[PDB]
JSON list of C-alpha atoms in Angstrom, two decimals:
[
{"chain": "A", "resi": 1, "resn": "UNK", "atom": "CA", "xyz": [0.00, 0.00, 0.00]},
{"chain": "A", "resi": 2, "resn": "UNK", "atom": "CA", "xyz": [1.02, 3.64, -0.36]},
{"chain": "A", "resi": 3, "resn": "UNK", "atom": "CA", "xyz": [1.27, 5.89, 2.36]},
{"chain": "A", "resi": 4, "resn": "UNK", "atom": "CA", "xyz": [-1.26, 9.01, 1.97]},
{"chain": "A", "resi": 5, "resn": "UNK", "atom": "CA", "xyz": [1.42, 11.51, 2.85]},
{"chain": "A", "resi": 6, "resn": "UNK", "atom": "CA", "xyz": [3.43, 10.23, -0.10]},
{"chain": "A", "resi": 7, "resn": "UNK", "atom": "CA", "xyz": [0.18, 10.32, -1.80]},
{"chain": "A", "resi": 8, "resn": "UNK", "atom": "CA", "xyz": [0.01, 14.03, -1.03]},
{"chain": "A", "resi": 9, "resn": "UNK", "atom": "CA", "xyz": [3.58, 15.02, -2.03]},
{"chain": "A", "resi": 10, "resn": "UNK", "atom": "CA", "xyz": [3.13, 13.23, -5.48]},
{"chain": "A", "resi": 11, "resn": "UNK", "atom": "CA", "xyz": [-0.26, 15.42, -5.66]},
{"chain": "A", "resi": 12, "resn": "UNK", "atom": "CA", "xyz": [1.39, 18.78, -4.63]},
{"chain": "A", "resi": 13, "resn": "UNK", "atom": "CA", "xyz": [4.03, 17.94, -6.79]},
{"chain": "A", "resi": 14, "resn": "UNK", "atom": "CA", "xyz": [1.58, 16.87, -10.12]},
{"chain": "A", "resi": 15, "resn": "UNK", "atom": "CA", "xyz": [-0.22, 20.09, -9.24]},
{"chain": "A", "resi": 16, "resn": "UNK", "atom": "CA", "xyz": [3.08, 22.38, -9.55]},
{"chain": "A", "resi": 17, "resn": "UNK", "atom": "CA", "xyz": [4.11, 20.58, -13.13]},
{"chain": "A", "resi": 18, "resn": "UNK", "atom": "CA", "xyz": [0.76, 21.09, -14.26]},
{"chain": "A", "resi": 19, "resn": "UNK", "atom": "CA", "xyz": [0.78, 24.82, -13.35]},
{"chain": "A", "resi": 20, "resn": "UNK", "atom": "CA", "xyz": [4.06, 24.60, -14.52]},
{"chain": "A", "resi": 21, "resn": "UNK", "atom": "CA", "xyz": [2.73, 23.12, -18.32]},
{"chain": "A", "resi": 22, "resn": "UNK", "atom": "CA", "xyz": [-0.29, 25.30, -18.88]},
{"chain": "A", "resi": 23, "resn": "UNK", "atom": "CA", "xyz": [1.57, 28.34, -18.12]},
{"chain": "A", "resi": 24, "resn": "UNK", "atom": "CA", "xyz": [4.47, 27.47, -20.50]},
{"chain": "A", "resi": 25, "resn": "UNK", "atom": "CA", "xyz": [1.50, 26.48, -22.81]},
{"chain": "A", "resi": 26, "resn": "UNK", "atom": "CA", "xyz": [0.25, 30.07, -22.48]},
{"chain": "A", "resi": 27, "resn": "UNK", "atom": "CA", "xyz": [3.67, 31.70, -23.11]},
{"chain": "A", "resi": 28, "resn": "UNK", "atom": "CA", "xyz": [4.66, 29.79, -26.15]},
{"chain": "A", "resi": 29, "resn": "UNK", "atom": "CA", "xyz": [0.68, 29.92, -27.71]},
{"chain": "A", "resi": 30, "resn": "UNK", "atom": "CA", "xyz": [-0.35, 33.12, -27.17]},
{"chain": "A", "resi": 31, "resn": "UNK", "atom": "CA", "xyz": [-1.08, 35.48, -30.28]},
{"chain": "A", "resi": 50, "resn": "UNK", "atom": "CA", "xyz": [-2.94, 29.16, -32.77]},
{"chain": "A", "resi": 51, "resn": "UNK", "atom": "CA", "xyz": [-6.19, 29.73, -33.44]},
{"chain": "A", "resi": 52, "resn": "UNK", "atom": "CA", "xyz": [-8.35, 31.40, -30.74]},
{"chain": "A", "resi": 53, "resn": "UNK", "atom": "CA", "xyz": [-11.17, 28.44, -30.54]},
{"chain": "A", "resi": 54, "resn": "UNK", "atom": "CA", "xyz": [-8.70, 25.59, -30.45]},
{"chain": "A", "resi": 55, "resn": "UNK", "atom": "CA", "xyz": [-6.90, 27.74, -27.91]},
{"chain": "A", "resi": 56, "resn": "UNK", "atom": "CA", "xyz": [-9.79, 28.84, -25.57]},
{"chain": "A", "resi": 57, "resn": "UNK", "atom": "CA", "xyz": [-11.01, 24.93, -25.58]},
{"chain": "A", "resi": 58, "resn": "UNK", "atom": "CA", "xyz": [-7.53, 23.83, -24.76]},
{"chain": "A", "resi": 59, "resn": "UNK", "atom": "CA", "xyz": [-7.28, 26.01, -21.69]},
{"chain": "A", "resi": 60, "resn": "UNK", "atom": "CA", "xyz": [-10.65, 25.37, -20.81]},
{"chain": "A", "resi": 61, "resn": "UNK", "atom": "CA", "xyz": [-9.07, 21.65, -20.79]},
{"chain": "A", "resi": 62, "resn": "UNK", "atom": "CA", "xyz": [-6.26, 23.31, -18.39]},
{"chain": "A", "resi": 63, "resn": "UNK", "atom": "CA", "xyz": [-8.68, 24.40, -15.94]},
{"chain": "A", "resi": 64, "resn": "UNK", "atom": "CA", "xyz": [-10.85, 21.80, -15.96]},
{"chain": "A", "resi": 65, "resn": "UNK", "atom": "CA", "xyz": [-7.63, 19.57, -15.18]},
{"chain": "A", "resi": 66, "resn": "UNK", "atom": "CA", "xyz": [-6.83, 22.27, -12.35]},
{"chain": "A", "resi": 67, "resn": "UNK", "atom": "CA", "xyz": [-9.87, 22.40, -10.72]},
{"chain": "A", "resi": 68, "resn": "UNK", "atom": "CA", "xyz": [-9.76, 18.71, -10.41]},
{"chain": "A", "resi": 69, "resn": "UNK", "atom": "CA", "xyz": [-6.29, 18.39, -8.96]},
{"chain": "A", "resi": 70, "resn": "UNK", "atom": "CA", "xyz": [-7.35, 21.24, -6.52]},
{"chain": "B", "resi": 106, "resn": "UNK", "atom": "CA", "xyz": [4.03, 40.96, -37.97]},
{"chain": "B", "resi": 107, "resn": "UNK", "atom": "CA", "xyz": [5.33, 41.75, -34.35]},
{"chain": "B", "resi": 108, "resn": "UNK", "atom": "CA", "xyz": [1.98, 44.43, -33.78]},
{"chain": "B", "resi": 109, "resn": "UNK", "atom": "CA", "xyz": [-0.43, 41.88, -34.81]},
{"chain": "B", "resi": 110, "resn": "UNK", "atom": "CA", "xyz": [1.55, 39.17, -32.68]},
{"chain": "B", "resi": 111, "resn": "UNK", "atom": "CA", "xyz": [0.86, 41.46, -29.78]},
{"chain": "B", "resi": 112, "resn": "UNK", "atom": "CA", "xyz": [-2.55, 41.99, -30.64]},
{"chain": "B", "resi": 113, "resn": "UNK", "atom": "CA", "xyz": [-3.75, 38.68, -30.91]},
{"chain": "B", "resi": 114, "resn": "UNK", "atom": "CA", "xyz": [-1.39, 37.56, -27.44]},
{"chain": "B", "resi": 115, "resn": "UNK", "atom": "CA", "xyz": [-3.83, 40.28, -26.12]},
{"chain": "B", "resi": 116, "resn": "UNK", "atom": "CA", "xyz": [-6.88, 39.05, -26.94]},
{"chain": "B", "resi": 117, "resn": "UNK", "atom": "CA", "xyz": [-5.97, 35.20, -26.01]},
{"chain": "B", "resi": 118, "resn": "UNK", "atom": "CA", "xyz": [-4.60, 36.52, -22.46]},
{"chain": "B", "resi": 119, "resn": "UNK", "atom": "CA", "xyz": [-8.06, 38.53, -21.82]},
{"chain": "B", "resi": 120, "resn": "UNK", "atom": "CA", "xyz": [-10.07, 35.59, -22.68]},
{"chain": "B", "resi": 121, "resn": "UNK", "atom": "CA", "xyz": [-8.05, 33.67, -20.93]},
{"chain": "B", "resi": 122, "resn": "UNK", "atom": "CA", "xyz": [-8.44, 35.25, -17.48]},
{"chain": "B", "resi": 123, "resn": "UNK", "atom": "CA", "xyz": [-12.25, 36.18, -18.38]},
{"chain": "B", "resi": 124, "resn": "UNK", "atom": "CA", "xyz": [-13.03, 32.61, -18.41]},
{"chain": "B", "resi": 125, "resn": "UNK", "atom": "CA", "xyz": [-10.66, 31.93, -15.61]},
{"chain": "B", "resi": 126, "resn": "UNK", "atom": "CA", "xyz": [-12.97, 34.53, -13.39]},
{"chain": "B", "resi": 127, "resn": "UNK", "atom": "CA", "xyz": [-16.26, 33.19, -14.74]},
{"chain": "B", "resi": 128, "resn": "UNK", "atom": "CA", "xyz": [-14.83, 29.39, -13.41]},
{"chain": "B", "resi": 129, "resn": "UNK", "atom": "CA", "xyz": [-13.55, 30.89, -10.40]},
{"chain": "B", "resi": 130, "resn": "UNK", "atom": "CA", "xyz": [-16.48, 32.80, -9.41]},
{"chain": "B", "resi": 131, "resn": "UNK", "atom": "CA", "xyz": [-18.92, 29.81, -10.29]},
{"chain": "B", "resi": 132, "resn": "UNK", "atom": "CA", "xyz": [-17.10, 26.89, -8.59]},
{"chain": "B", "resi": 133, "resn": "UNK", "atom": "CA", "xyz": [-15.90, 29.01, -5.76]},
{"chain": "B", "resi": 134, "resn": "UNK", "atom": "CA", "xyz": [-18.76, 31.97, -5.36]},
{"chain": "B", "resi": 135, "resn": "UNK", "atom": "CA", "xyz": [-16.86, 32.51, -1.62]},
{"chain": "B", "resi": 136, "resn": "UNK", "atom": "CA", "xyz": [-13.99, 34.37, -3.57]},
{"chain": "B", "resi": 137, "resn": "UNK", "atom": "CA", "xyz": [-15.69, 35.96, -6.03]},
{"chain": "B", "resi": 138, "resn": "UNK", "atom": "CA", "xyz": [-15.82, 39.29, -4.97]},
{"chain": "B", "resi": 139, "resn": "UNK", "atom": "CA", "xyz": [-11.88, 39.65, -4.50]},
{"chain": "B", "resi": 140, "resn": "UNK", "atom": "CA", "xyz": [-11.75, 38.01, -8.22]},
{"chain": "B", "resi": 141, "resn": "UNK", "atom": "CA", "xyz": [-14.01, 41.27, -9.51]},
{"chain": "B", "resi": 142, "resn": "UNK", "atom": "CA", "xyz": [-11.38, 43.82, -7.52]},
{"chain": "B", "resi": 143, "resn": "UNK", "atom": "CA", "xyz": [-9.02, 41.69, -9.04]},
{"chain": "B", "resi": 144, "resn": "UNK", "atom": "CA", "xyz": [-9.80, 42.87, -12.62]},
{"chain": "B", "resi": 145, "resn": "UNK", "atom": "CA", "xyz": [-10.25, 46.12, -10.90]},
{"chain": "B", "resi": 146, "resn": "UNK", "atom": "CA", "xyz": [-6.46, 45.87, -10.01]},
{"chain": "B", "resi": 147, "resn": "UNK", "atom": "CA", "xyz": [-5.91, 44.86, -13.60]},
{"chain": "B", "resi": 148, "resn": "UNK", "atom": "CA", "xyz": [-8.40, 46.70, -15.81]},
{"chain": "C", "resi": 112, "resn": "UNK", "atom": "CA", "xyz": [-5.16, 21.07, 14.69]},
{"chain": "C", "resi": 113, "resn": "UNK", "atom": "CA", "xyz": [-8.53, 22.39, 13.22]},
{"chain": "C", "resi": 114, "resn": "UNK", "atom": "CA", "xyz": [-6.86, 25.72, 13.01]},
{"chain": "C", "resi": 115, "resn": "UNK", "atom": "CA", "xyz": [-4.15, 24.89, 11.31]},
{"chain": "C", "resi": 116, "resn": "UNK", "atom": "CA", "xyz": [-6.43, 22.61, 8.79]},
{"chain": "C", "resi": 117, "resn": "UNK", "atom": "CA", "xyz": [-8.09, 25.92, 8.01]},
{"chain": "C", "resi": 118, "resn": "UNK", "atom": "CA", "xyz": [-5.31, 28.00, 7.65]},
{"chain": "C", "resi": 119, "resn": "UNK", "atom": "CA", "xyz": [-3.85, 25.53, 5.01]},
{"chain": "C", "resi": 120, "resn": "UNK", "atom": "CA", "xyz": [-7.53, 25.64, 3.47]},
{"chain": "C", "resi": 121, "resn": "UNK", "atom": "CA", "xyz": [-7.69, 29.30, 3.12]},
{"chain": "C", "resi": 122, "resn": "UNK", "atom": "CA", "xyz": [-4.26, 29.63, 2.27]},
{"chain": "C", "resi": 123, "resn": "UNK", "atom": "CA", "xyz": [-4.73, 27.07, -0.62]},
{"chain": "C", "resi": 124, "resn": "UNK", "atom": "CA", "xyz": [-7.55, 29.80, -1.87]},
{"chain": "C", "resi": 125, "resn": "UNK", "atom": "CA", "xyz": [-5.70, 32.40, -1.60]},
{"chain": "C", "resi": 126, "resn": "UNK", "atom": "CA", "xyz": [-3.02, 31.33, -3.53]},
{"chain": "C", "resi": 127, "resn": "UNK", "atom": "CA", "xyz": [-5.37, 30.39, -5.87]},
{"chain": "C", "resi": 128, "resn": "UNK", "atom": "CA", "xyz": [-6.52, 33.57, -6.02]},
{"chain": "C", "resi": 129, "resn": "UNK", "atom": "CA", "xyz": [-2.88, 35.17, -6.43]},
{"chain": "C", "resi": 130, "resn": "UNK", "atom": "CA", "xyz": [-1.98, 32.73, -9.37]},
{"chain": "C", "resi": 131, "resn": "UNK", "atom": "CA", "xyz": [-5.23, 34.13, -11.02]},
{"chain": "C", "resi": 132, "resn": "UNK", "atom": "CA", "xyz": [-4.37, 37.83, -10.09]},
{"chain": "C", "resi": 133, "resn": "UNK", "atom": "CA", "xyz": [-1.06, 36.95, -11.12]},
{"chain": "C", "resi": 134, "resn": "UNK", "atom": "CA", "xyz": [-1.72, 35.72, -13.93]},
{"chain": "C", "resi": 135, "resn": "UNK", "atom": "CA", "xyz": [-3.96, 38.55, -14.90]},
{"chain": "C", "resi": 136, "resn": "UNK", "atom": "CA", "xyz": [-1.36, 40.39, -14.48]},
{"chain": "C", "resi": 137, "resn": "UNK", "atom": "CA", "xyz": [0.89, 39.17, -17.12]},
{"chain": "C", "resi": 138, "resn": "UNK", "atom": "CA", "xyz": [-2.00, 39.69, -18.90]},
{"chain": "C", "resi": 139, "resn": "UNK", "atom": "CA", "xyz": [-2.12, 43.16, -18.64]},
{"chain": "C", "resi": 140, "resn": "UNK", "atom": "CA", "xyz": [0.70, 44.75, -17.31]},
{"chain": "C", "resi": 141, "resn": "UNK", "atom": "CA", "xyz": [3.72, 41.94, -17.25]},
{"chain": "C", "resi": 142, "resn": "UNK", "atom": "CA", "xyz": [6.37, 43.91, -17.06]},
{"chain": "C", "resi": 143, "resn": "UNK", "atom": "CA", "xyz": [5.70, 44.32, -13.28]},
{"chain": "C", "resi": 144, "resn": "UNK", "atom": "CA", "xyz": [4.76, 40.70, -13.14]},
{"chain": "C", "resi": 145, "resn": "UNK", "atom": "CA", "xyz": [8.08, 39.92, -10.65]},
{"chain": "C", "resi": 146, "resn": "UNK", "atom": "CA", "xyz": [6.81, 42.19, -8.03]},
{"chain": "C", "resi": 147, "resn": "UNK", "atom": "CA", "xyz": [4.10, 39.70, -7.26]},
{"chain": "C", "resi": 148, "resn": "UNK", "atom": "CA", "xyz": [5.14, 36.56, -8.03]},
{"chain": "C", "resi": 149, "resn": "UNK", "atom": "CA", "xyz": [7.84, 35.30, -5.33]},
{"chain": "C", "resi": 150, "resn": "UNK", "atom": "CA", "xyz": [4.88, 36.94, -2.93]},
{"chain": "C", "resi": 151, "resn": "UNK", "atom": "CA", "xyz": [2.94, 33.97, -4.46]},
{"chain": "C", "resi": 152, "resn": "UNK", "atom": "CA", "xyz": [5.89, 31.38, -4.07]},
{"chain": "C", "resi": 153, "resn": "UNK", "atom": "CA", "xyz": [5.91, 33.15, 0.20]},
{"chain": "C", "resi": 154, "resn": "UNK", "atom": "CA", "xyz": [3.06, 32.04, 0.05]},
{"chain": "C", "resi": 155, "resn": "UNK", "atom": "CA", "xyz": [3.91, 28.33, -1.03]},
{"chain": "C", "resi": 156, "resn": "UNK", "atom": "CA", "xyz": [6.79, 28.75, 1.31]},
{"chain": "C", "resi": 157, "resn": "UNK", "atom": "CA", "xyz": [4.53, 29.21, 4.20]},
{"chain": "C", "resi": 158, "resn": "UNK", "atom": "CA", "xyz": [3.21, 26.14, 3.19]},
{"chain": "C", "resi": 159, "resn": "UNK", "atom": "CA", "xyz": [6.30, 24.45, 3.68]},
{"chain": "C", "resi": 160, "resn": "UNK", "atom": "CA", "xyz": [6.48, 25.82, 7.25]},
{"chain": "C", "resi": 161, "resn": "UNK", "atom": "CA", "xyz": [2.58, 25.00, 7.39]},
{"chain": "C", "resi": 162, "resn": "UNK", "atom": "CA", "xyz": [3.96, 21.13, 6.66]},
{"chain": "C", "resi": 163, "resn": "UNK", "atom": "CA", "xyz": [6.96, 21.43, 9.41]},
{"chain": "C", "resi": 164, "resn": "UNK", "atom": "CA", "xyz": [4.66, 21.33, 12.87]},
{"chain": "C", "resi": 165, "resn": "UNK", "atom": "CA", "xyz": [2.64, 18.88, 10.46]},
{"chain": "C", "resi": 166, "resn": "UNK", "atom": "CA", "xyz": [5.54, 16.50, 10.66]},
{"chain": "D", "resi": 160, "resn": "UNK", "atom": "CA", "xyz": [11.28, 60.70, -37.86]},
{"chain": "D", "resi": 161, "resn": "UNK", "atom": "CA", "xyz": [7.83, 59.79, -37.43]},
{"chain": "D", "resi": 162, "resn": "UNK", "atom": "CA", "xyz": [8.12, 56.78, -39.34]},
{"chain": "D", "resi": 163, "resn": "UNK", "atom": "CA", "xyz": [11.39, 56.68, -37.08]},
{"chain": "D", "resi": 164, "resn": "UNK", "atom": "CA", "xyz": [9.78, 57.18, -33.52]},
{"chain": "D", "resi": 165, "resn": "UNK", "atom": "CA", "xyz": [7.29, 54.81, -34.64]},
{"chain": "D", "resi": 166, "resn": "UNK", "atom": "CA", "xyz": [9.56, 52.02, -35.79]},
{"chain": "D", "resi": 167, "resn": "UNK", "atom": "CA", "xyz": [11.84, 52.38, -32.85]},
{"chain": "D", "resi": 168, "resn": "UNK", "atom": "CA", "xyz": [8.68, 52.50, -30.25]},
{"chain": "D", "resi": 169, "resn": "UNK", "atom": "CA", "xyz": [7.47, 49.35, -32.05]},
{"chain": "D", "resi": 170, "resn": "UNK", "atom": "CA", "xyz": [10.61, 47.51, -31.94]},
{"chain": "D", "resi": 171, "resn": "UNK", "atom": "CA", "xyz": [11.59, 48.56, -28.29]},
{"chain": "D", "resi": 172, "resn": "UNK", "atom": "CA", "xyz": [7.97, 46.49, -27.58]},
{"chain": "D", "resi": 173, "resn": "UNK", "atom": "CA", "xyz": [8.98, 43.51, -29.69]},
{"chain": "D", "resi": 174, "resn": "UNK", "atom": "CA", "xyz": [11.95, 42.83, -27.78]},
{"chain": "D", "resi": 175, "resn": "UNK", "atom": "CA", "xyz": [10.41, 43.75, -24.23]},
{"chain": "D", "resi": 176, "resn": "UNK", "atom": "CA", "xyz": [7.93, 41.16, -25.02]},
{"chain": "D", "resi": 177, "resn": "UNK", "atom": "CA", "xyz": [10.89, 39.00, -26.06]},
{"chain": "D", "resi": 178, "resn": "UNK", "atom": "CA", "xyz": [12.62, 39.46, -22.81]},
{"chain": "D", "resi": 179, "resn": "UNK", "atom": "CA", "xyz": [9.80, 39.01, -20.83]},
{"chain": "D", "resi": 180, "resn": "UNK", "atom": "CA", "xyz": [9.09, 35.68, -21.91]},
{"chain": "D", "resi": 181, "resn": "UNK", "atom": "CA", "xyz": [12.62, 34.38, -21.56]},
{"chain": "D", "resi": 182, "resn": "UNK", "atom": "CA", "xyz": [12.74, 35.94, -18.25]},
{"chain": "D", "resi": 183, "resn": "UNK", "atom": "CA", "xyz": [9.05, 33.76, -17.49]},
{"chain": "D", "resi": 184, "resn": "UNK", "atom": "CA", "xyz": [11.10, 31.13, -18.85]},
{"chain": "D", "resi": 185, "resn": "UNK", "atom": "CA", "xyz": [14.47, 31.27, -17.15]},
{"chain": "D", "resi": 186, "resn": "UNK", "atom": "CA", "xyz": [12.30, 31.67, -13.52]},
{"chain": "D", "resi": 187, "resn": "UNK", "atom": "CA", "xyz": [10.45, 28.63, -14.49]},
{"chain": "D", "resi": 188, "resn": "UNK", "atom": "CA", "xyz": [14.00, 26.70, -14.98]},
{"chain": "D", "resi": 189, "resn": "UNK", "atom": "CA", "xyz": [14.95, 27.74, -11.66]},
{"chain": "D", "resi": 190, "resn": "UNK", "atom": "CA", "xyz": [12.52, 27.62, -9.82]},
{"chain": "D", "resi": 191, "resn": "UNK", "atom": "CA", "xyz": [11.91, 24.32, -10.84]},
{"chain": "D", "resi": 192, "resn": "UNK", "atom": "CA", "xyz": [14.51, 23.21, -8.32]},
{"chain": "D", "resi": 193, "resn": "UNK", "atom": "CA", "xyz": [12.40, 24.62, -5.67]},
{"chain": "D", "resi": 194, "resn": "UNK", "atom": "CA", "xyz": [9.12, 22.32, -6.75]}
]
């Protein structure tokens, strides 16, 4: 079995890469269409509401 | 080139952060009023 | 250790909240972005002293 | 120099906005340590 604590550090730390990815997905996209775009982020934040 | 570059980063970025405050406010309506002064510290 | 369970609640919010003002504020005005965001990672840094007592 | 001041305003943006995202991306690197 697997400790919850570990559990929580592999969270915290899945939670900071993901940050990590959609904001470097922001820098290097902005200016790819605008649809595809906005549904991709809304992806993002689905994906960080979840891991919150 | 570079203007319309800027231009269009603009427009991605303020969609970007509309929707973020629309999610914000609806899935967490305990913060939204901080999120609205937030685009007043913004906008 | 209610109190601290809160505390680590609201502070997850309100870092929430400071990645999304943060954020808005590359948005807008980055070139000032710095100024807020090692306040955000203070923030996160608290929460490694949040996870210190914890332990 | 209107076509000047315009050109030079223009391009002093282009690479501000060029710096800032290597500077987003060279606090990323490093801070990457700290995750």
């Amino acid at each position: 079995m697997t400790d919850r604590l570990t559990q929580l550090q592999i969270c915290l730390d899945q939670m900071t890469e993901q940050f990590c990815a959609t904001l470097n997905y922001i820098d290097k996209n902005h200016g790819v269409p605008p649809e595809e775009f906005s549904n991709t982020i809304d992806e993002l934040s689905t994906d960080i509401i979840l891991k919150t | 080139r570079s203007n319309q570059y800027q231009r269009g980063k603009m427009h991605g970025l303020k969609q970007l952060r509309d929707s973020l405050a629309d999610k914000i406010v609806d899935e967490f309506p305990e913060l939204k009023e901080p999120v609205e002064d937030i685009i007043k510290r913004t906008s | 250790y209610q109190y601290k369970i809160q505390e680590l609640r609201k502070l997850l919010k309100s870092l929430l909240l400071n990645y999304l003002e943060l954020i808005g504020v590359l948005s807008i005005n980055p070139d000032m972005y710095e100024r807020k965001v090692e306040n955000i990672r203070t923030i996160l840094v608290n929460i490694h002293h949040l996870l210190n007592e914890y332990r | 120099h209107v076509l000047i001041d315009l050109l030079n305003w223009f391009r002093t943006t282009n690479m501000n906005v060029n710096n800032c995202i290597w500077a987003l991306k060279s606090s990323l690197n490093s801070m990457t340590n700290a995750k």
